Design a protein around this ligand. Structure first.
Ligand SMILES: Cc1cc2nc3c(=O)[nH]c(=O)nc-3n(C[C@H](O)[C@H](O)[C@H](O)COP(=O)(O)O)c2cc1C
Ligand code: SF4
Ligand code: SF4
Ligand code: SF4
Ligand code: FES
Ligand code: FES
Ligand SMILES: [K+]
Lengths: 213, 87, 430, 43, 263
């Protein structure tokens, strides 16, 4: 929650970090996507890759990224602290992120948050003692019509109810993987109880095409 | 950054000795002109005043900041070093 | 025409909106994607821009500037720098989730739009900036882009037209402000997502300091159809200067919250009842609607009775179409809390760059928290109104305006609710 | 013509590196990038 | 031949293309209020204190950044311009600490002086104020970063003039903080100049701390002898004792900077 770094025995410039050879080849691909002489544009993707390898970003991880791209270290510190998806502290194996913005709140996102905490016995912004779950509230995740919803790692679980979210957490504990997407009974964003549109088969190539082409 | 105290010409005299008062340590002086500062609209007015009163004077030409070339778009240059790395 | 709505399925542009057909290239082609792209490309930028201008299409990212005129700022000779198209897939406005469905179910429409839209501007490549939370959708788009590369539809000699075009996908890292067009550019360049002042304009100095056009996913994805079927076909839907179809998100207190394509200028009541299954508890239970994402001011039930869903109608009602995300609130809602949560959202999203939003939005957030409890005086309502007017129009980007407008809509239409909240608090503590 | 199934089930097998593996596979299709003429603005 | 005509409160002035609204006003003796802008740094445009009405334009423009178009009539004293200044000053002071008596900038503070001349005379902020922890960046510059107004002058000076990219902003929104993130000294032969350009008492001279007030110092214009550049300086004295050394502007020598040894 603090945006100043203080060296600790676990997070200091000597804390070991280095990209694996497989990730270095990925880095060479990221950098090649930008014009020559503008390598600093790869800071976000490469810094996000360091999180994917390591789970979070120690200061030594940010120092390596600055070194690779030849940017000043402070310019990588600015990016790390500006974007909310970068973890500057360790998070649990499953980062539970519950949307509580008004569209999700209107469909009772509090009950989802209350259910999770009761299940995991923690609070918003805490990690379980086993270090399997970290819980936080986030802003609109772009899945409002499927509210209430949560994101766990890269996956969305949508149309949740307190029973559904507890099912997802149970599977995560068990070691399995729950399929993402709505849990109400619809596949995605279509209205429940029957489509009001896109019921006729779509037209084929050339349909409706003006003349002169 | 205010420049409002750089509009007018001033006349002051050479600084002279100040010493510590034995009783309290205050700054004592024997210079009656130590605090005398005069204001003038132009250096010509100031030079005229100093000559009719018989004072030797030094005149220092007014320093005016030169015009700069400012471009906000220069912060984002495609191929020039003016490109900033942070905002 | 005098009434709008009831868009026939054969007139819908995003025909795989729900992902019940194959989203990969074979599915896309069978639905008409990538058909005669070569011929469109060889028509030339002037013809493409002509079709977009005549279609009357307006930007779908929230601001609604005429797309054809905006894309014409790029139709000028190269001065030695590359030219780029940036596709805004940040999809961050609360209540909005339309671009998510385009990206994951019709990715080849977006890719073809980038090529068609990129050709009209003379761009060498397209950067599709997508929010980092859309990992699965970004991966779907990455699969589609590979298929387009493998079929020869993008890259060298794209579609056989001899035009070279690359489509890059870059992911955000969690910032709503990065949906702003110039903060999006700063984010691509590996800086904090802080919007730039204008001038310069992106069409002059943009990504990497090069001519750039930032276009919303919906704006780009519909352009190939507008070229294939013509601007006149598109301009035939909706009111004058409010043309075309539109993706609507209906969330909140509705029976069937959903995404749906519908004609521009369809009545708000019709859209909710026909597609969303009506307001929860019936139309009489409606309290207020936010008709175009959280940045637009709310309108009460009386205005919602007959208001049309287009740019000009909603301005007439003291709001805006925005992204066409309809958040419905029924009478059980605590309207003051619902708005207070949106200000709290803008406090967490402000980039902090410029004084009126860095300080003003946090100020409005603190005042709105007390208004939720009634721990205030009625004289503070006019103070809060003036504070919002000080932020609005004095900031670098529109996020400041997007935080002031919700507050004004609440004070404008629900002042008695605010005052009665304060009266209750005073009575309890006396 | 089937309209009663979800045909976007591929993204249930995506993993941590799916996005950056595809970006690594696309690298051979790209055109040579433009150059500003210097290694960076600090050169 | 390239000059274009603009108007500053109806007064015609001829300016080169690219001249900003702020520079045009300066040609007729109007100094636009400013915080983030410095004529020797790159334009920032974030403080918003320079907003000014352009006649017939509904929206105010940041004068420090907006290039001036021919025929523009810049209204530096209109009601819209005045109210924009009052609103921005109100936001600047909302979280500013009540530190003037213990703050060394008092008496020579641009926030104080522009608040007197351009802002309102009272507060309507009824909430608690932000408080920020103090960073350590060496034995020369003391930081009380609760006073920082986030103008980024120090960031721009360090990167562009001193050539050191160790200062930046961390965090976002109201919690954005200027500093080094890590515990790092800003030890540069030009580092002391950030004291001068910081408009507030966020960065102050550690050796000078608490010793004097500006109104009581006598100013002696002199020259530096710590090197052969001959940097122009002001020797602030009080009651026959030297209190501090400040740069004196000379365009052909030191501009408005000095070395830390000189300072
Ligand atoms: C805070 C903020 C967030 C924005 N987010 C988005 C967004 O997520 N998607 C989008 O297309 N436009 C967004 N915009 C609007 C863009 O700045 C810009 O107007 C738009 O991308 C232009 O595309 P268009 O003309 O096709 O609509 C946002 C603007 C602001 C001020
Ligand atoms: S209005 Fe807010 S988000 Fe926009 S530039 Fe200013 S501080 Fe940043
Ligand atoms: S910086 Fe200026 S306004 Fe702020 S406490 Fe110091 S003297 Fe007062
Ligand atoms: S420390 Fe001073 S110069 Fe630096 S950003 Fe803050 S107020 Fe501006
Ligand atoms: S409000 Fe929760 S996904 Fe949009
Ligand atoms: S002086 Fe222009 S915005 Fe700061
Ligand atoms: K200072």
């Amino acid at each position: 929650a603090l945006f100043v770094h203080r060296d600790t025995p676990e997070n200091n410039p000597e804390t070991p970090f280095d990209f694996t050879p497989e990730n270095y080849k990925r880095i060479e691909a990221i950098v090649k996507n930008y014009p020559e002489g503008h390598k600093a544009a790869a800071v976000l993707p490469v810094l996000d890759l360091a999180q994917r390898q390591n789970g979070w970003l120690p200061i030594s991880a940010m120092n390596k990224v600055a070194e690779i791209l030849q940017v000043p270290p402070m310019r990588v510190y600015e990016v790390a602290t500006f974007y909310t998806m970068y973890n500057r502290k360790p998070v649990g194996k499953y980062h539970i992120q519950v949307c509580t913005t008004t569209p999700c709140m209107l469909r009772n996102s509090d009950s989802i948050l209350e259910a999770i905490q009761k299940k995991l016995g923690i609070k918003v912004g805490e990690t379980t003692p086993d270090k399997l779950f970290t819980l936080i509230e986030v802003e609109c995740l772009g899945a409002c019509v499927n509210a209430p919803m949560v994101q766990i790692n890269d996956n969305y679980y949508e149309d949740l109810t307190p029973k559904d979210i507890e099912e997802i957490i149970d599977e995560l504990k068990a070691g399995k993987i729950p399929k993402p997407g709505p849990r109400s009974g619809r596949f995605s964003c279509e209205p429940a109880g029957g489509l009001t549109s896109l019921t006729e088969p779509p037209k084929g190539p050339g349909f409706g095409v003006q003349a002169g082409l | 950054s205010g420049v409002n105290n750089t509009k007018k010409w001033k006349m002051e005299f050479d600084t002279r000795e100040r010493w510590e008062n034995p009783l309290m340590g205050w700054a004592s002086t024997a210079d009656p002109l130590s605090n005398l500062v005069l204001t003038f609209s132009t250096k010509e007015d100031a030079v005229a005043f100093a000559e009719k009163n018989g004072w030797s004077y030094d005149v220092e030409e007014r320093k005016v900041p030169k015009p700069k070339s400012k471009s906000y778009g220069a912060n984002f240059s495609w191929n020039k070093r003016t490109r900033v790395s942070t905002k | 025409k005098t009434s709008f709505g009831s868009l026939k399925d054969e007139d819908r542009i995003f025909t795989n909106l729900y992902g019940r057909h194959d989203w990969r290239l074979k599915g896309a082609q069978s639905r008409g994607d990538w058909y005669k792209t070569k011929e469109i490309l060889l028509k030339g930028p002037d013809w493409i821009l002509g079709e977009v201008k005549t279609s009357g299409l307006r930007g779908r990212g929230g601001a609604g500037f005429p797309t054809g005129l905006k894309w014409s700022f790029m139709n000028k000779p190269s001065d030695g720098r590359p030219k780029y198209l940036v596709v805004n897939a940040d999809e961050g406005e609360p209540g909005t989730c339309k671009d998510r469905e385009i990206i994951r179910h019709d990715p080849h429409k977006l890719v073809e739009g980038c090529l068609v839209g990129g050709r009209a501007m003379g761009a060498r490549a397209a950067y599709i900036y997508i929010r980092g939370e859309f990992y699965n959708e970004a991966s779907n788009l990455q699969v589609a882009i590979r298929e387009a590369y493998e079929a020869g539809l993008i890259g060298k000699n794209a579609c056989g037209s001899g035009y070279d075009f690359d489509v890059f996908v870059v992911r955000g890292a969690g910032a709503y402000i990065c949906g702003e067009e110039t903060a999006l550019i700063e984010s691509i360049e590996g800086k904090q997502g802080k919007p730039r002042l204008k001038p310069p304009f992106p069409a002059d100095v943009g990504v990497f300091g090069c001519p750039t056009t930032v276009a919303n996913v919906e704006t780009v994805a519909v352009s190939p159809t507008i070229c294939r079927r013509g601007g006149a076909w598109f301009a035939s839907f909706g009111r004058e200067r409010n043309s075309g179809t539109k993706l609507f998100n209906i969330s909140g207190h509705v029976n069937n919250p959903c995404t749906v394509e519908e004609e521009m200028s369809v009545p708000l009541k019709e859209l909710i009842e026909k597609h969303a299954g009506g307001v929860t508890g019936g139309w009489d239970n409606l309290l207020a609607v936010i008709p175009g994402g959280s940045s637009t001011p709310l309108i009460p039930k009386s205005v919602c009775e007959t208001v049309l869903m287009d740019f000009d109608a909603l301005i007439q009602a003291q709001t805006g179409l925005g992204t066409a995300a309809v958040i419905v609130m029924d009478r059980s809602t605590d309207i003051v809390k619902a708005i207070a949560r949106l200000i709290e959202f803008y406090k967490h999203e402000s980039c902090g760059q410029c004084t009126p939003c860095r300080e003003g939005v946090d100020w409005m957030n603190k005042v709105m928290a007390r208004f939720v409890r009634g721990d205030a005086r009625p004289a503070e309502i006019d103070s809060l109104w003036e504070i919002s007017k000080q932020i609005e129009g004095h900031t670098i980007c529109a996020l400041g305006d997007g935080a002031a407008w919700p507050v004004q809509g609440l004070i404008r239409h629900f002042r008695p609710e605010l005052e009665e909240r304060m009266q209750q608090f005073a009575q309890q503590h006396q | 013509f089937d309209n009663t199934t979800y045909k976007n089930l591929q993204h249930h097998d995506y993993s941590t590196y799916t996005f950056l593996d595809l970006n690594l596979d696309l690298s051979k299709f790209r055109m040579p990038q433009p150059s500003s003429g210097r290694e960076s603005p600090r050169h | 031949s390239n000059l274009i005509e603009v108007f500053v409160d109806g007064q015609s002035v001829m300016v080169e293309p690219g001249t900003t609204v702020l520079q045009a006003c300066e040609k007729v003796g109007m100094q636009i209020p400013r915080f983030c802008y410095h004529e020797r740094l790159s334009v920032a445009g974030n403080c918003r204190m320079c907003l000014v009405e352009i006649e017939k334009a509904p929206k105010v423009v940041a004068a420090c950044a907006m290039p001036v178009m021919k025929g523009w009539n810049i209204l530096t004293n209109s009601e819209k311009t005045k109210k924009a200044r009052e609103g921005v000053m109100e936001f600047l002071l909302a979280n500013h600490p009540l530190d003037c008596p213990i703050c060394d900038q008092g008496g020579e503070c641009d926030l104080q002086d522009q608040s007197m001349m351009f802002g309102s005379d009272r507060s309507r902020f009824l909430e608690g104020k932000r408080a920020v922890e103090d960073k350590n960046i060496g034995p020369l510059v003391k930081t009380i970063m609760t006073r920082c107004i986030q103008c980024t002058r120090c960031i721009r000076f360090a990167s562009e003039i001193a050539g050191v990219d160790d200062l930046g902003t961390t965090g976002r929104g109201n919690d954005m903080q200027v500093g080094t993130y890590i515990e790092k000294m800003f030890m540069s032969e030009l580092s002391g100049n950030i004291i001068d350009i910081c408009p507030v008492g966020a960065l102050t001279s550690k050796p000078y701390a608490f010793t004097a007030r500006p109104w009581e110092t006598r100013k002696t214009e002199s020259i530096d002898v710590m090197d052969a550049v001959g940097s122009n300086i002001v020797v602030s004295t009080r009651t026959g004792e030297v209190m501090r050394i400040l740069p004196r502007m000379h365009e052909d020598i030191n501009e408005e900077w000095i070395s830390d040894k000189t300072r």
